[model samples]
Target: DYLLSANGSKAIDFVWSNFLKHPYNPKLKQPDANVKAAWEKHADWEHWSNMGQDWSLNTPSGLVPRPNHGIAHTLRVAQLVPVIAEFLKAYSGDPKFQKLTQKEIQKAQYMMLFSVIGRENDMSWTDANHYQQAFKEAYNGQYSKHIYATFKENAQKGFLNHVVTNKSSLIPSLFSDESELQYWAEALDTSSASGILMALAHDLDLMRCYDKGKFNSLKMKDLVARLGGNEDAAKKLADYAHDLIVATGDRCMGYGVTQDYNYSLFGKCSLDPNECLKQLQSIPKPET
Candidate 1:
């Protein structure tokens, strides 16, 4: 009911049916006939269109898709690395998780990186070149050259790094906190369960994009359950949320938003250490 209320029945049903039904093993590889066929069928424009239109194409005005820089991307990388790491640590003893190889984990990391960068519509060599260069800089060569090579290969093969559709279009012209919350909930709920981590990664990304200090505590709870009661995983996620919130507060103070507005609702904490600590404390701590 929580999932349904947040995402709607159709969204939950779509994800569970399409992606989560399969265990997280047998990491999707490239060039294999079955894998190729699956990519052809599932990684096309239609699936993306159904997920959300903004996710399918480049941004309006035809500028380069979401860039690799910015606070949103930074916080996403910080959050996802630890989340995936904690997931691996928590599940290391399980056979199903044992099937996940180092190479596959590397690929998944790169996929997350590229997804945040946003996929380009055209599969031209120039676009690939740009992405390779940008990825190297953004990630500081944390991954091998093979990751970049495979990213290009997968892009040419019609694979999207992201599993969820971009739903930026759903946001209204005059958005309120309530409206923003609904949009984010629906977006996160409808995302592919195959890319659960990536889906939630982008959820945080979107939260930072719209509202700096606020985060969805319920989603963190959902993620904790999804990870099979890995409190470490939940804590890492929650810590990152607080990290971003603190960062937002710092930005607000440094920019005079704290001083300018006597009662500003925009900043989550108005230079009050107690308020910031209170916001952090409000997050539901994972149980042992």
Candidate 2:
């Protein structure tokens, strides 16, 4: 059997610093050059790329490992929400981007459903039980014989959501403390819903415009323009929930809502050690 090794989170900051930037020209170099090229080629590059690489951070090893894949997937779907919402909002009166067909709707539903599932759990390719269960469900009970029979079908669709949800949730537990856990859970809960909606909206809009061939000649710039004509807007399109949550409160939730409100109003990280906890003298913990 072909095997894989589970390396923990990779830092995108290191990946960018080590791989993307040129020694001489900092501005022109691309992070993951191929990925960068692809981004530039696509009109949705700014929006998608920012969404794609959000959680990636720099590491000491000078390498950027992939973060929790499940979270990444959810982040992707979440990021797409606002763009799709904007499109629908803009063309609400037009029949062209409305009235999706049954097939299109089903596809949209499938993607949205999977995006949620993806956020909810993460699975591994090596897990026989996961693979088997995935096969049984992805076809909506269409294929029920054996793993081989439904493996390909499940492999394609089921794995995306399954691995992400299960695997990503565990990511926080690896290196996080109690405070970090509190922050992350709060942030994720706020973001996941908006992300799911964004993914659905994106598909609906795409189906209306592309699948039906209503706007076959539409350009990528048109799509970009529809998304509010800037990278920040594109970022919001992808993760409005995260944005809202981030905007709402910056203090530790335990610090009380007033602190959170103050942090938000002042634009400072509530957890900033210098301001919040002053003087980090080491303390001892009793052995269990």
Candidate 3:
């Protein structure tokens, strides 16, 4: 068995504790009074700080921000990432997944944990921008240095490798940039299975939205269609997974075949409208 200071069970705690050190965490607290005022001056800090309403759904009742892409959801995604990785590792038939060792699953969990650290509080920002943002935050922040460097590096690399969203143009942007970040972006050129697993974070998010009968936006439905069910997005993902599997020989398909196999529980049950289709359609089409 392999062990990490930030193990799977402790992953969520590790995230919160370390996030306090990162620029993205909301409280924006630092040890001294001087740093607190200094922190507010950062552009990114200001962006994240302005988002009390964005993290939550902005309801009139003002419930503690709805669990959309807020802190609770981030924690849930961090926890679920490993669960899904381990599940697929044990039971998936993909040559890559079946070949994955326990160590990689744990490492992938670590990588996926920070994947969301760069995200905006709400859906207003597209993930394309989020990926670039995450890359910069992970490479430059103290969080990656405190945890593990190569794992974080490769995680970002593998994340881009496995994800079709920003694979092409975004990567070159990182490497070609004139800043020191260009060298750090070197991780994107390598191949690893951890990223293949790291990609599952969004899967868990989409599944949750689907289960709650909340595929109301084009953004949500479009995301929900990504994993399986014979769509074009699924086909593209299959191509990317095959590329990743071949690249790393981790022998895992990037898409969660296991998750899709059990889709009936949420897929059929929630989407049937006669099941979910009824409730979801109530949402606006242009909301994306």
Query: Which numbered prediction scores highest in lDDT against the true structure?
Result: 3
Model 1: weakest 10-residue lDDT segment is 48-57
Q: How well does candidate 2 match the true structure in TM-score terms?
A: 0.25
Per-residue error for 150 in candidate 3, Å, reads: 20
Steric clashes per prediction:
1, 21, 9
Question: Which of candidates 2 and 3 reaches a greater lDDT?
Answer: 3
Task: Please write out the lDDT profile of model 2 over residues 73-182, one tens digit for every residue.
Answer: 22223333433544444433434334433223222322332332211112122233333333444445443343222333432344333334444543443323345334
Collision pairs in model 3: 95-251, 96-250, 96-251, 96-252, 97-251, 97-252, 270-276, 272-275, 273-276
Candidate 3 lDDT at 215 equals 25
Per-residue accuracy of model 3 over 1-288 as CA lDDT, tens digit each: 111232332434444343311222343111233333444445554333333433322222233222334333343344444444554443344566666665555545444444554332333333223333444454564221211233345345534333334334333432233342333244333324455555555553453334333422432244233332324443333333323222211112223331222222222311221222222223222110
lDDT score, candidate 1: 0.35
lDDT of each: 0.35, 0.30, 0.36
lDDT of 1 by residue, 1-288 (tens): 111122222332332233322222122121234323333342322221211212211223222221222222433342354345446446434445445444334333333433422122313233334334444445555432433344344432322212234233212211233454344333322322325545555554443323323334535455566567675655565455545444433222211122221123213232222243344334443322
Q: Report the number of the highest-TM-score candidate.
A: 3
Provide the TM-score for each candidate, comma-separated. Answer: 0.33, 0.25, 0.37
